[PDB]
Amino acid sequence: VVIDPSGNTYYNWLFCITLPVMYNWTMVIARACFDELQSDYLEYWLILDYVSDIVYLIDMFVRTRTGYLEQGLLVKEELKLINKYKSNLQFKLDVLSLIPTDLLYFKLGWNYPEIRLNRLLRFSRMFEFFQRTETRTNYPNIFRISNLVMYIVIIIHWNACVFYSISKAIGFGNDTWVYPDINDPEFGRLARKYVYSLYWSTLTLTTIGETPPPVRDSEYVFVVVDFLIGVLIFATIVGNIGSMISNMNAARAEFQARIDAIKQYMHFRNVSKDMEKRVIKWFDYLWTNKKTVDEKEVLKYLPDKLRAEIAINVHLDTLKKVRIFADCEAGLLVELVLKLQPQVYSPGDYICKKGDIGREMYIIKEGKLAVVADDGVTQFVVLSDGSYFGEISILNIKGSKAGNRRTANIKSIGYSDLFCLSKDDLMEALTEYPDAKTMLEEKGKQILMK
Amino acid sequence: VVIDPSGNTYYNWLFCITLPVMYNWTMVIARACFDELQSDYLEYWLILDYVSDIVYLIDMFVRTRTGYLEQGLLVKEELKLINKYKSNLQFKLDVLSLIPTDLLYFKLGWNYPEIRLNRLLRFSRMFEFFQRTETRTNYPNIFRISNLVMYIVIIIHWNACVFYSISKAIGFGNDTWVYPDINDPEFGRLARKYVYSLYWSTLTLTTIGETPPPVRDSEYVFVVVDFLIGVLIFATIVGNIGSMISNMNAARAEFQARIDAIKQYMHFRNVSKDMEKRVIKWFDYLWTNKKTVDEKEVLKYLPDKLRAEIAINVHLDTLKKVRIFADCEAGLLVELVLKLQPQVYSPGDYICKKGDIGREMYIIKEGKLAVVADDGVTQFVVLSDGSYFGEISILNIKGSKAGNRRTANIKSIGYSDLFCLSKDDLMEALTEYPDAKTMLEEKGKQILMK
Amino acid sequence: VVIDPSGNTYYNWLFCITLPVMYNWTMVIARACFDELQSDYLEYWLILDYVSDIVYLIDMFVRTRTGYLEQGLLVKEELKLINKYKSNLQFKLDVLSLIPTDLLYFKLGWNYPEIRLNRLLRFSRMFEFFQRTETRTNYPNIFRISNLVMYIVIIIHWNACVFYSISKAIGFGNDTWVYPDINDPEFGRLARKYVYSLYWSTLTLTTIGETPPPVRDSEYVFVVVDFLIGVLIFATIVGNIGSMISNMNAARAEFQARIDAIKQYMHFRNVSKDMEKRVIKWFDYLWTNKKTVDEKEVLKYLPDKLRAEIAINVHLDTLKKVRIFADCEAGLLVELVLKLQPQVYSPGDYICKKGDIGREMYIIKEGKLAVVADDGVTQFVVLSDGSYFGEISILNIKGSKAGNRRTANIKSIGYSDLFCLSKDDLMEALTEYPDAKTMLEEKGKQILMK
Amino acid sequence: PQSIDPLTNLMYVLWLFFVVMAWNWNCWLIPVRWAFPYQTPDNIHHWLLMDYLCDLIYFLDITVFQTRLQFVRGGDIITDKKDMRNNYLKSRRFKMDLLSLLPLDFVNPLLRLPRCLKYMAFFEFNSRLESILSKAYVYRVIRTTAYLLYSLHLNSCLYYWASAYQGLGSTHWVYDGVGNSYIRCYYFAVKTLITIGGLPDPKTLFEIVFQLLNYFTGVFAFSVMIGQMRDVVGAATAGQTYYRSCMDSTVKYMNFYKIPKSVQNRVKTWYEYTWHSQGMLDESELMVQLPDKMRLDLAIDVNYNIVSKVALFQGCDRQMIFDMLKRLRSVVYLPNDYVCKKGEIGREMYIIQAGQVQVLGGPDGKSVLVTLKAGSVFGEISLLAVGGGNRRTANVVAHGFTNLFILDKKDLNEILVHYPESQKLLRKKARRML
């Protein structure tokens, strides 16, 4: 066997059924309208149509064999798969698409391939494959733009075929609007026919005009209706493409709008040029190191377990270096990485100063932190990445010298990225982990005697 | 070394290298397609190409001399800088851009300047300059509009060059669609060549048409593709420019939308016309002084420290006028500036009614408030600047009657824009500084004995 | 006075100065380019220019009589107003707009109103009037559409004047692109002249083409540049129109999106049809009665006193009938109406149920209740609009038969829109007022002995 | 039906559709009869017959149907016949209907131009057809393109009027008189309002003024209608676009940090199954927009019988179950994902909505001791501990895509202290489990 829809082989068959359906949506109407296209390459079109019908029959076999989810589980019982496939509208559309209409080649001649319009009813396979591709590709917006561009190409090609067919019904060369006479050697070539029809359909759908005006009421009706198609349907697709291109830039546009709002606020308040330059440097650091994206808003819809799975892989290198996590039991990390808030500090920033209230502890993800004196001109010792600080004034140290006050000045040299862990978030993990609390109290009481 | 990319000396270099990149993206294709442009000004083009190559080599030296950020610290080791630069794709693109392709002048003649089309591979430097200029200029929307307009100009110029090349590859004056014959003294001028090619490019890319229809199959195919380029690539940039000018005054649009929502709510509620006039006068005051946008929402994307420094810098003159601090130490303003929130009050509005739950200290920044009597005709004390009022109710001093309630009624004589300080936010912040509690208690008892 | 900026007379003078500014911004360039307009109506244009200059002088006098805000107080000192006005850029623009350049009519000719283009420098009056009209008028959407339309009219008029000036510089009838020979009686008519210039300007700026192609290189360059300018302007038109469509639909499309989302949720989860009908009927009752607007979201940008005034004036009729509100003290409503949530109930939906914990106290605004018992086929007494119920469970009376539990049942006969007071929200304001506790305890005792 | 509520009673919606058909006939056909000479004396009687039918529809609307529309006054539905008539006469709808039914005997078809003033019925029918029809985004598209077609229709009628005023074939710009008048005038209106161009140039002053105003109205009104239609089709796929945007932002975040594909496929699959089993990602986003009473209503129908049929909430207080579902949030658990960890601490109690979870225990684990289907509760035991005293007794692995409900630590206990008898009943049923 039973093919998993989430599996890779189902995607491979989705592509392998999309190729003949895309062939049918393009070439069947072209062969039906451009009779020279069907007549000249009849062997090639017969081979391609028979291959497409064989692939349709293998898609029959796959649709009877692909699984469907029932109460979460993927059921693999054959009769259940058969009944589920047959009960759907998909089976009816597919079996109407695969009726043997090729037997009507004898009744209507070999120049009538418009009896294969039933084969377009496998469009659901195209849309399903395009939905599955956009989920699993690394560039979803680019593929979406290409898909809508191809929809434009299909609509333009179909309008070209329709215009050629209407010129055929009215008569070539009878009017200045229709396609010219085939008896002209230049306009009698099949390439000229298709390419001029594509030109007419392109200019008409895009509402450029600059084409010979209709001289017949049916031509006026078709031109009005197809201008309306180009307005309602085509221009909507072009607007969707523009919206998708804007959605590529959406995070960058939002971040630049934040920058513009902050600069406009700072321009009104007559802030000094040094602070404006500092804020500009901070935002240039944010974009240059690509820290504009935030973890909270992107992963806001995720469950806690899957956010924990992601946050471990993001902070793999940091959480091995820390003495609290992944050194003894590695148990509280899966519960506590959700409580960590990443914060980035500018060079020279004082994170916590002596005599200040301690509402959080810090874990150094990146950067080099230094402990300094009251003036801060010199540094006592430097703290590398992976370490942690600011835990003295958080938990209840027995016999504390000051208590709930910072015992050291923390100077941030360079741009240090480091996690934040507040009071109650830390207590809601320490109450369930008394052993982890004791290890922190030990080093806290060991370092507080100085 | 070190160029310090966050510094101004690197951004000033970014403009110096972007000009050769613009010249290569603009003039190399023009000289490649318009052969008269290459032949007529050959000395100037050789000089400019040599200067652009020299600036490219200096950019190579700078990119070997520029400092990245490992562990959040600026790198000064020259070998480390060279190894970091060489490992990136930027070095590969830059060394492909500086391939000595100019040696093929002696193999393909002096009229073949498309061999130095590899110089276009330094586009990333131009895009980096546009990124940096966007976050540094005082006019971000105007610069962004000019950037996208220059993208439009470059695309139209490139399509003009492509049209002239296709007219050259087919034959000048061969058909009605191609560029006319060179031997025509009016159409053989280089200015006429480039300007009419630009006219055709503008007509095709803006989807105006108004061009002679194509004759050959290749011309029809190119016109279809070019109109699709003008519908898809060109009109997306045009539409996002239109949205950007529409979203230029985003804060003004949001404030106006707030006004329309409030007025539409009050229209159906059938509120009195005087009340509507007062609301409109209030919003006119908000827009005239540009107090429309809130400081909290704009600055909440900034880190707490940088916002702290910004809030001190904007309100440095005001917070120097208070009597709580800024006398000996002047260190109290930094900690409590985040907890205080800006407010503004209408004239005649009783900011602190007599016998009310006291919740704020209400530090005055702008506005002359008066301590009115119970009947309200007479006013005792005028509080102009740096004069707190409401230091009775927040802290429950001993020997105080009706400590929770207000001891006087305060009326705003004019539009008083002043900072409110929360109940629990100040009480937590009050315990750190021993001077603030003493002054607050002494002033409260002194004005309570009156 | 002196003139207040927020007063109605300042808006009236803004209109009275916008009229000559709008005259000078459209007719000066029209007379400068179209010589037949300047020559024929000299008697009218001299009087209009003199009137515009007189109104400009009166506007400059008004600018010295407009009181700004020092400490939120209107500065009525004439010398201070004159000193601040003269130090601004607006004084420089006003002086530059009143340079006696009209004295150059003698030394340049009576058909040269190009000199008096400096009167356009008072664009600030027009922009300020349009920024204050949109804030003040009851139809901001219609006024914004009309303002965008007249901006496009002004731009198209200016481009028409530019095209006519370029045609007269190149020569009338010298090319097929320029305006034809004015010696011809058909093309020599001034109305026909300006209308064709405006028609060309609309054709060229709104990206239509349908113009004779340029002949000379200057004509081609101007046509390309004006295509680009008009494409950006048409993009601005489309973006602004979409913005006002979204703003007009912001009251409608938000509610419709909520309706579509809740209908998708109800259909997807397969709810009961009766419950779906009830939910849709309640939402339709909100839409027909315009009660779907959020009170808290819309009324949160106003000050607490001003929002209290709005909420009191909306709920003026209800609060008089309430026995707790505006009956004994009339001092608790000003702080308790803010801490209130309006809710609307369907008929017969069991607002309060027996054997349930109630955390809210409900006051009826414009509804009718039933207070049913047991099965609910019988009712005790209807609750009129302006009464309060559900105060038994929230208040912790020592002599209570049931603690924190509702008594009997409450049913809504019709569509009842009633306020609610939360338990912990009311208990904070109930303990502060000594009179409120005693009467609610007495009412609870009376209910319990009932 | 002596009293009809406007919202329900689809027969009133059908009658209002008939009124809309009459109003659309008036709006579309008077400009034709005013401009085009289609009101010939040969077929004047058919025109007047259908006009009389539309006037009869208007009269039956103003008398028979609008006076039977029940209304709410004083918060109560009013059914008495005389009160409905008084409310209707007081309403703006009666003013619009009376102004729309002005008697114009005097033939000029423009005398029936007041009949287009009955647009309130059209807005009411739009509201009903967008309220009683599921997935009514397609009707909004049809309505907006009907506005566009009506604008093109009015422009075609104006063009034919201008041509007839100018001579009807006097110049190349005006209509030349050959072929069908309506479709060729509509062709002009299409190439004008869409601003396509490609038309004969206007020669005389009147024609140039008309062409100027028509291109101007095209540039603005065409942009208005296409902006409306793009906004309609964007709101049609607004939830899908938002889900795709969130998924792409998440995928970009995981791609940035080089997260392995084994986790990326899990996140993608979780988004896919959440969108296929909930339809709008986070349910609480729509829950917060509704009143608390409607939260209780939309909870008491879909996921109340499944949580009241469990083996642990039997014999409890029925109002706790009402209080149960304000804090129950659904979550999707992937197959072979550890819902419970034996060595780890327990924050949450799990109630299966649609899925199967397997409890593993015994020698070295990996033995399905019991399988819990939909309507079952697992993980309840570890909540009743102080400071996380109790661990999970056995690890639980979801067999498939399990959708299940959540109650956090100190969240069930917030509503458990309200019910003491239910508290001790849950304590007893937890004792029997251990």
Ligand SMILES: Nc1nc2c(ncn2[C@@H]2O[C@@H]3COP(=O)(O)O[C@H]3[C@H]2O)c(=O)[nH]1
């Ligand atoms: N007092 C002290 N703190 C140190 C030292 N080394 C690192 N620290 C950390 O610096 C932190 C400053 O804030 P805390 O007092 O909360 O906690 C302190 C310790 O976590 C040290 O040698 N002495």
Ligand SMILES: Nc1nc2c(ncn2[C@@H]2O[C@@H]3COP(=O)(O)O[C@H]3[C@H]2O)c(=O)[nH]1
């Ligand atoms: N009663 C009184 N209050 C004053 C005076 N000067 C300033 N105030 C402030 O006015 C405030 C009114 O509200 P509070 O009673 O909370 O606190 C009061 C004082 O902070 C004064 O001279 N007398």
Ligand SMILES: Nc1nc2c(ncn2[C@@H]2O[C@@H]3COP(=O)(O)O[C@H]3[C@H]2O)c(=O)[nH]1
């Ligand atoms: N139980 C009861 N409640 C009444 C009666 N009349 C009015 N009420 C109100 O109905 C309310 C329902 O909720 P509560 O029990 O909290 O408080 C109740 C009273 O305020 C009555 O006769 N009996």
Ligand SMILES: Nc1nc2c(ncn2[C@@H]2O[C@@H]3COP(=O)(O)O[C@H]3[C@H]2O)c(=O)[nH]1
């Ligand atoms: N060990 C075990 N657990 C069961 C059984 N049936 C249901 N469970 C659930 O498995 C859960 C694991 O976590 P808890 O210990 O919190 O609570 C446990 C019960 O809710 C069973 O038969 N054996």
